[PDB]
Each structure stands twice: as C-alpha cells, then as structure tokens.
Short mmCIF file of C-alpha atoms in Angstrom, two decimals:
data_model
loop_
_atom_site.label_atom_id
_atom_site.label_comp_id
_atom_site.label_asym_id
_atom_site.label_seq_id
_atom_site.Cartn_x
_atom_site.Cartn_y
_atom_site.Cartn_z
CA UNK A 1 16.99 -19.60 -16.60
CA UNK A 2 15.17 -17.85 -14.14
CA UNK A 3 13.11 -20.42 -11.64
CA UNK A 4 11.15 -18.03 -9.20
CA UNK A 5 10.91 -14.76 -8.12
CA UNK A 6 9.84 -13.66 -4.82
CA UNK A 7 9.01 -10.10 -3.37
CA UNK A 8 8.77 -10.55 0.46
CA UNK A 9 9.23 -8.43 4.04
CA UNK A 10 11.56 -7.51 6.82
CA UNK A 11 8.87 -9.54 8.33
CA UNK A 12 8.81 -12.30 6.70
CA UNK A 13 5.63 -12.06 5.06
CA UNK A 14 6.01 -13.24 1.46
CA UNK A 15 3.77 -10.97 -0.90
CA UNK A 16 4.23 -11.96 -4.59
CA UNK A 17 5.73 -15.35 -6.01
CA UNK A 18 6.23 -15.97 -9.67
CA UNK A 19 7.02 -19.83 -10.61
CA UNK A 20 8.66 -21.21 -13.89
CA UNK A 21 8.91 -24.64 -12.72
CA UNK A 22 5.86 -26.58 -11.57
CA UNK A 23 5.94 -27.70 -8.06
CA UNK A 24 3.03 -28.49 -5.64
CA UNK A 25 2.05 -26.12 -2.69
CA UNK A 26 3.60 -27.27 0.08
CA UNK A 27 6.98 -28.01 -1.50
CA UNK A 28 6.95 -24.43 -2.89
CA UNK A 29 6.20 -22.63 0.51
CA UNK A 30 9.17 -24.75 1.94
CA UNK A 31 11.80 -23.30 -0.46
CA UNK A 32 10.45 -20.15 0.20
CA UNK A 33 10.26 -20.13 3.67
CA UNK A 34 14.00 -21.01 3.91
CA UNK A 35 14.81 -18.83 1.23
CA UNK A 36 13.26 -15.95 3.17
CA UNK A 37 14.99 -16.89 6.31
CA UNK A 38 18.28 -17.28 4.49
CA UNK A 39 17.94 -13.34 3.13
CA UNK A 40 16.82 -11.89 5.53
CA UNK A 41 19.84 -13.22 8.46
CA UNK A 42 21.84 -11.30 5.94
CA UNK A 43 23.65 -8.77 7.82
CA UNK A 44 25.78 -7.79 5.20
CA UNK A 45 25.91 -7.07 1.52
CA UNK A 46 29.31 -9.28 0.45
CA UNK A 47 27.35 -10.34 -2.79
CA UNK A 48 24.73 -10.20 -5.27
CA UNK A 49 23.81 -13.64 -4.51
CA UNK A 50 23.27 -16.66 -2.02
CA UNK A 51 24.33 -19.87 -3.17
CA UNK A 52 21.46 -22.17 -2.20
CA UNK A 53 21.03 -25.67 -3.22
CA UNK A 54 21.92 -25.88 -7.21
CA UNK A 55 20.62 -22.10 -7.30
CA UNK A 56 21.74 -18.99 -6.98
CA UNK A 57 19.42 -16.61 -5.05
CA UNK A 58 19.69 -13.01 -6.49
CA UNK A 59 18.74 -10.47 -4.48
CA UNK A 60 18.33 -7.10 -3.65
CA UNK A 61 16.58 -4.86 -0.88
CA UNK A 62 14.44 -1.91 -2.43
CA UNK A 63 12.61 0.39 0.15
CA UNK A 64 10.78 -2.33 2.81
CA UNK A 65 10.89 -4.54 -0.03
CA UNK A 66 12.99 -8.02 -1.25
CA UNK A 67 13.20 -8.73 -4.58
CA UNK A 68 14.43 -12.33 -5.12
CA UNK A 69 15.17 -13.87 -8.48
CA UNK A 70 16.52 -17.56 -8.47
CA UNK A 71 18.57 -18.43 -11.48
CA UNK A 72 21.02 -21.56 -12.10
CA UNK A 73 24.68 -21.13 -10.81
CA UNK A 74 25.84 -20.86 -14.13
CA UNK A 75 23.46 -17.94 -15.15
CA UNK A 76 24.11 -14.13 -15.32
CA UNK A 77 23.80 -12.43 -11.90
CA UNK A 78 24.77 -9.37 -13.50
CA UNK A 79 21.38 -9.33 -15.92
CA UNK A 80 19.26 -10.78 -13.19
CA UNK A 81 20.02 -7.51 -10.68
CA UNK A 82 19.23 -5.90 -13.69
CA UNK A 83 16.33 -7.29 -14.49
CA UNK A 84 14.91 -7.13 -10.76
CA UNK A 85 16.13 -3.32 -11.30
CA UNK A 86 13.85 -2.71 -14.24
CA UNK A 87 11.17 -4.33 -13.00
CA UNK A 88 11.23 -2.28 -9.70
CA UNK A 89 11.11 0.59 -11.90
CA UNK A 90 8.28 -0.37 -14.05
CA UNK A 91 6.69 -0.61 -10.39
CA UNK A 92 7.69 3.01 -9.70
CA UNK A 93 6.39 3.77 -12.48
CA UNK A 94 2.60 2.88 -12.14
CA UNK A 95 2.42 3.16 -8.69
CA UNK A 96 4.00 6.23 -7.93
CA UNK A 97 6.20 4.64 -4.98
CA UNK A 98 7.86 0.98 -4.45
CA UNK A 99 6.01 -0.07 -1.19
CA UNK A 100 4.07 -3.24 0.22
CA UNK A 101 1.30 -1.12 0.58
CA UNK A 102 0.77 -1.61 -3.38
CA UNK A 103 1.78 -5.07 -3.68
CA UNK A 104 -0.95 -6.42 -1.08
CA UNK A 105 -3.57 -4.26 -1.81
CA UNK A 106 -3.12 -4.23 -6.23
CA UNK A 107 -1.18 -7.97 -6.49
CA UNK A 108 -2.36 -8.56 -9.86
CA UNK A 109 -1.10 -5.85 -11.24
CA UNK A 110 2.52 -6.45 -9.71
CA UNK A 111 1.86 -9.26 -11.20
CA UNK A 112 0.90 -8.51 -14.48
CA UNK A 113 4.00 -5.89 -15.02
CA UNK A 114 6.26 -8.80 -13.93
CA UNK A 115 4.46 -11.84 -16.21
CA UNK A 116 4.13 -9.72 -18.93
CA UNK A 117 7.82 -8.16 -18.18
CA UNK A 118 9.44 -11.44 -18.13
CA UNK A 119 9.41 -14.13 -20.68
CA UNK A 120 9.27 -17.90 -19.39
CA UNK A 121 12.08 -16.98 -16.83
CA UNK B 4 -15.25 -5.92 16.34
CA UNK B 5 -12.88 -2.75 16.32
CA UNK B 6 -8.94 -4.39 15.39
CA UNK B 7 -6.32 -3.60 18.22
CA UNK B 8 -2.51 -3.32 17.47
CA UNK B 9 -1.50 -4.27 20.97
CA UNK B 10 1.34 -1.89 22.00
CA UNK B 11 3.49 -2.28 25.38
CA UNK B 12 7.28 -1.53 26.25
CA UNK B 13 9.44 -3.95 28.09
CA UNK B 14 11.74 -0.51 28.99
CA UNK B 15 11.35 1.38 32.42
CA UNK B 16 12.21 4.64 30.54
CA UNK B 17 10.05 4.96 27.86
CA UNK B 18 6.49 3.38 28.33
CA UNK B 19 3.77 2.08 25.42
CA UNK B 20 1.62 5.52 26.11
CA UNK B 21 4.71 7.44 24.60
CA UNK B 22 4.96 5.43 21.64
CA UNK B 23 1.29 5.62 21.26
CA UNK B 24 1.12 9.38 21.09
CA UNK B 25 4.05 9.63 18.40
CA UNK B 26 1.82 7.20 16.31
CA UNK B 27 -1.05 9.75 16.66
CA UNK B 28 1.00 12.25 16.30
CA UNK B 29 1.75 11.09 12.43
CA UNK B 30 0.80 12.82 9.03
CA UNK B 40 -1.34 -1.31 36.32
CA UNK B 41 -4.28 -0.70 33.23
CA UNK B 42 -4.71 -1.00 30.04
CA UNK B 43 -5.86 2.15 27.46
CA UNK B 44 -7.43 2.32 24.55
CA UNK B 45 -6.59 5.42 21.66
CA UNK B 46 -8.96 5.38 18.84
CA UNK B 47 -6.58 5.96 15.42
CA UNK B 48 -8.41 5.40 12.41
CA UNK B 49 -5.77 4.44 9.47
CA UNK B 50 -6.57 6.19 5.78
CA UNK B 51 -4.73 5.34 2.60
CA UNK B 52 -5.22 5.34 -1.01
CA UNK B 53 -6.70 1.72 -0.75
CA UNK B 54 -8.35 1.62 2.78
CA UNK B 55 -9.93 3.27 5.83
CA UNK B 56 -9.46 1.29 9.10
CA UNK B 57 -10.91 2.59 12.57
CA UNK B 58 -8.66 0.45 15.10
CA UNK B 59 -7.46 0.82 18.83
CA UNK B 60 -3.90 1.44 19.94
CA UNK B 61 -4.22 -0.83 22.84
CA UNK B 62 -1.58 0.62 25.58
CA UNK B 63 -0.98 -3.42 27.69
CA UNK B 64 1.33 -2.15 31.21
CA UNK B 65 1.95 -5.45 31.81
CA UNK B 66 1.17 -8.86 30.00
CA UNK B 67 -1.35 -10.57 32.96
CA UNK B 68 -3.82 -7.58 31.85
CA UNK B 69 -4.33 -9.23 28.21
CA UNK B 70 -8.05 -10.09 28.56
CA UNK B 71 -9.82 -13.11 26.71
CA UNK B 72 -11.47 -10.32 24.94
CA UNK B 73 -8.62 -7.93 23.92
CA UNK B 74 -6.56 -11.20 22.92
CA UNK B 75 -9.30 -12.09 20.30
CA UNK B 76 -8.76 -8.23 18.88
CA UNK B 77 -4.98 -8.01 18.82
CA UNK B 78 -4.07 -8.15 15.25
CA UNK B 79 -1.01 -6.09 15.50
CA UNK B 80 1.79 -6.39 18.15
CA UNK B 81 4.42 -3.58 19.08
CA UNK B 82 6.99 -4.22 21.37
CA UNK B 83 9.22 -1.27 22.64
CA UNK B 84 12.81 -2.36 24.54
CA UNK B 85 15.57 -1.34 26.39
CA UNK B 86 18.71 -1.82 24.41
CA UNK B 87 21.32 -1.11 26.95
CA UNK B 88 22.08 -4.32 28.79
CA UNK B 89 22.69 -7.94 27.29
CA UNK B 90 19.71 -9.31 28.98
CA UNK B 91 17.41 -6.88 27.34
CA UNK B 92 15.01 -9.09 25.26
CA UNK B 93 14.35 -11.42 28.14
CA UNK B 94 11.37 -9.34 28.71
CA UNK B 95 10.22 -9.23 25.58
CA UNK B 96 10.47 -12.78 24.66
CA UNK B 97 8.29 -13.35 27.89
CA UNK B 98 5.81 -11.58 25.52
CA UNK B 99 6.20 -14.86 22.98
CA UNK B 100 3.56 -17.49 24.08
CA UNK B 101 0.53 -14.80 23.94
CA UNK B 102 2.01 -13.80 20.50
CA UNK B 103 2.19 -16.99 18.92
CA UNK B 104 -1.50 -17.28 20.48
CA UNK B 105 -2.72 -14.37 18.79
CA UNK B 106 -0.66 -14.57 15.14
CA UNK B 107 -0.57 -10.83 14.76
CA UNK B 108 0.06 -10.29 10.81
CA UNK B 109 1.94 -7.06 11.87
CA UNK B 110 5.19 -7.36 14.91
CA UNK B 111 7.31 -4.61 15.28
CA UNK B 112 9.88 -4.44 17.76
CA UNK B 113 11.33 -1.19 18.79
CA UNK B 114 13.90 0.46 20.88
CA UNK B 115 15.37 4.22 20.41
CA UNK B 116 18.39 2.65 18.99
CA UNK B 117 20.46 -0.51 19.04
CA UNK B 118 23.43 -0.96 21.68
CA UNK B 119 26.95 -2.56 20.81
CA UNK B 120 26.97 -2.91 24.79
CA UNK B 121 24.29 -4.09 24.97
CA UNK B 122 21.53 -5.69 22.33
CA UNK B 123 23.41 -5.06 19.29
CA UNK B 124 22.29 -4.76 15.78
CA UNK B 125 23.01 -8.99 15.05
CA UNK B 126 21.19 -10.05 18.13
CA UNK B 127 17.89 -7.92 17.86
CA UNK B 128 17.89 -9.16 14.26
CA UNK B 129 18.44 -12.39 14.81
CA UNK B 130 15.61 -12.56 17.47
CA UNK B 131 13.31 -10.57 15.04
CA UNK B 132 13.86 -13.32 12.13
CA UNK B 133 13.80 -16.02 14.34
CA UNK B 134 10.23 -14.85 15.45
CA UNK B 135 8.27 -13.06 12.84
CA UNK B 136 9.25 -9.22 14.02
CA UNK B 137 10.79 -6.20 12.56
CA UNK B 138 13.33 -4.07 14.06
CA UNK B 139 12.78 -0.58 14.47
CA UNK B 140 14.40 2.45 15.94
CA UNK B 141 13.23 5.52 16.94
CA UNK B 142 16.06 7.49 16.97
CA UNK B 143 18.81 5.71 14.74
CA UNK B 144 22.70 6.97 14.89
CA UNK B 145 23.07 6.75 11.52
CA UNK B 146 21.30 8.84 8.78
CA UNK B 147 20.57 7.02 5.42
CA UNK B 148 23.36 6.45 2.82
CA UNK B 149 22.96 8.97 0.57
CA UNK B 150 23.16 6.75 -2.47
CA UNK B 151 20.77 4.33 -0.77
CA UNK B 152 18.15 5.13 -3.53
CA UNK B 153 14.79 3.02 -2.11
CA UNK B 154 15.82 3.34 1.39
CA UNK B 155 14.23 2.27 4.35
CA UNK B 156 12.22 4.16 6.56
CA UNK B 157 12.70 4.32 9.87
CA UNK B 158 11.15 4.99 13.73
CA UNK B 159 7.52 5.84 13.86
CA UNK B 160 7.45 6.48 10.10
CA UNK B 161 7.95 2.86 9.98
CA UNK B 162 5.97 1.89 12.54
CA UNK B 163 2.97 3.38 10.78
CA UNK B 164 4.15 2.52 7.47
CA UNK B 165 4.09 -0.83 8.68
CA UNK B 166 0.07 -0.49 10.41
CA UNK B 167 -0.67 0.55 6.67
CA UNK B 168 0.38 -3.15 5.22
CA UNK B 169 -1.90 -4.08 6.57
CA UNK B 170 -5.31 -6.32 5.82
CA UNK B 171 -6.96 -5.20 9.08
CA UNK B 172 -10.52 -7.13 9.74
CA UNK B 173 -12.45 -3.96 9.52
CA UNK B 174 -11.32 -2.28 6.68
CA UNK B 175 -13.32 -0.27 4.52
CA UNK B 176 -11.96 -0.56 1.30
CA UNK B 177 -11.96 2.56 -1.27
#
C-alpha cells in the first residue's frame, strides 16, 4: 500500500506530506530529506521509480512541483503514477493552475483533495 | 522591517542591476529597487537589494535578506568558485528563496550536472535566462523558465511583511 506522499521543490523545500504509517517527527523528516535529495539528483527520467530501502519511490515532476508516492516494491507503479496523475488534476481543477504558490498559501485544502482522494494509502 | 531578496552576479558581463530591471520589468555600492509583489493570496512591498561585491553586506541588510539570487558565468570550469564564496553569508542568513542563474548552462564549461549538483547540494535552484532548448511540446506542466521563474519563485514565498488578502 501506499506509505507517504510528498509534494516538494526544485529547492528542496518540502510543502505537503501525507503519512499512512505512524512515525515520530524527526524520523519522518529524515526519510524525507533523503528522499528529496535522492529525486531531485535525478538527471534523467530512466523510470517511474527509485528503489529506496524496501520502497519504491514513485515519482513524477508536474510544473515546479514533485509529486512523490511511496508504495512497497511489490505494488503497482503503473496505478500509483496514475493516481499522483488524478490527483494533480483534481488540483487543476480547484485551483485553476498546479503551482507552489497554492500549496503554501491554501495547504489544507491540498490536503483535503488528497485525504479525502485517497483511502488509507 | 521592509524584506530584501539579496541579488548579485558573480559574472563580469552581466551585473545584479541587469537582472534587477528584468524582474521589474515583469507582468563598489549597494542599491536598493522598491518591487512590491501582488498575488491572489498576498501583497509584499520588498527591496531588490543590488550587493557589487560580498564585503558590502551590512549587519543591517544581512538581518533583511530573505531571498538570495545569484547570477554566474557559465563558460569556464571554475565558474562557481565565486559563487560558492557567497556560501558562509548564505548559510548565515537561511534565505527560504536561492536561485542561481546564468543565461544558459555550458558543456565547456559549468554544465547542466555540475550546476545541479551544486544547487542540490546547497539549497538553490537553477535558472536560465536564455535556455537553448524550448519546452517539449508534450511536456504538459512544464517548467518555467528565466525571469518568469525567478519571479515565480519570489511569489512562493512567506515574506515577513506580507499583507495577506
């Protein structure tokens, strides 16, 4: 299933995080500070994923934006990009645009289209 | 106190005045150029601060710098050792917004791979002004690019003087 889902910038600057597995503070912002490294020293596009740890990191770049979805290695990469896909879209949708602009500025309702998008992961 | 994004260029061609005026121009000593950023969420009177050289940072305009724009000269292999002398007042100041930018990227020179791998490393985005390459046309949330960016990037922004809408 899906673990976490991160939307993040060319700058590093992670903007939304959505957890399905419980983990304390600190040990969250160290995955995704590595995880946010690992994306972004990408250079290019030779997969839908990154195999990290037991995980794979799915993950594509929309506008300014990265849209992160970790799933087991077994899972569907196929479904997640699609999933990331519709979600962007139901993002379009409200806000007119896909840009970090929104997603600082109106978080909880990225966050609400996502949560109430996706089911438990 | 009135937010600077701290601008300066580590090129002998192009200087941080330039850059500043194709900012305004969107939809030694230092300078100051009033901008005042408007969006759908905010309103944000802050200064372009034009820094010549790094010895004129102030105590003062250090405490204001909350953006930090960095322009280059791509041409030669040693062209971020200028820029990364830039790196200790950075990491001082913890600008939320770093930008570095050059007209474009040089396989002769500082390539694509080693201006992003500096930019990762510490906390920056690469821009260029003037990139070879248009967009792919099937690139459907592309990127923008040069001063769109730059400003673009100003925007996402939680400046300490916004007024919000």
């Amino acid at each position: 299933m899906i673990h976490f889902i991160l939307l993040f910038s060319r700058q590093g600057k992670l903007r939304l995080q959505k957890w399905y597995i419980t983990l304390p503070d600190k040990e969250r912002k160290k995955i995704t500070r590595e995880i946010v490294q690992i994306i972004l020293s990408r250079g290019h596009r030779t997969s839908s994923f990154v195999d990290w740890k037991e995980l794979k990191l799915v993950y594509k770049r929309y506008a300014s934006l990265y849209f992160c979805c970790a799933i087991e290695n077994q899972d569907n990469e196929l479904l997640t990009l699609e999933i990331v896909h519709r979600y962007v879209e139901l993002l379009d949708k409200y806000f007119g645009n896909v840009c970090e602009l929104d997603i600082i500025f109106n978080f909880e309702k990225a966050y609400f289209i996502l949560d109430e998008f996706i089911i438990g992961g | 106190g009135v937010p600077c994004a701290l601008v300066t260029s580590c090129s002998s061609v192009f200087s941080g005045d330039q850059l500043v005026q194709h900012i305004l121009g969107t939809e030694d000593a230092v300078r100051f150029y009033p901008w005042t950023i408007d969006n759908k969420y905010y309103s944000a009177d802050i200064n372009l601060c034009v820094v010549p050289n790094k010895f004129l940072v102030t105590a003062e305009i250090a405490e204001s710098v909350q953006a930090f724009v960095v322009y280059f000269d791509s041409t030669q292999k040693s062209g971020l050792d200028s820029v990364s002398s830039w790196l200790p007042l950075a990491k001082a100041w913890l600008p939320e917004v770093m930008i570095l930018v050059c007209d474009r990227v040089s396989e002769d020179g500082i390539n694509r791979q080693k201006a992003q791998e500096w930019c990762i490393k510490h906390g920056f985005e690469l821009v260029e002004l003037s990139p070879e390459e248009l967009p792919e046309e099937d690139d459907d949330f592309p990127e923008s690019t040069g001063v769109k960016r730059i400003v673009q990037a100003l925007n996402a922004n939680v400046w300490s003087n916004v007024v919000m809408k």
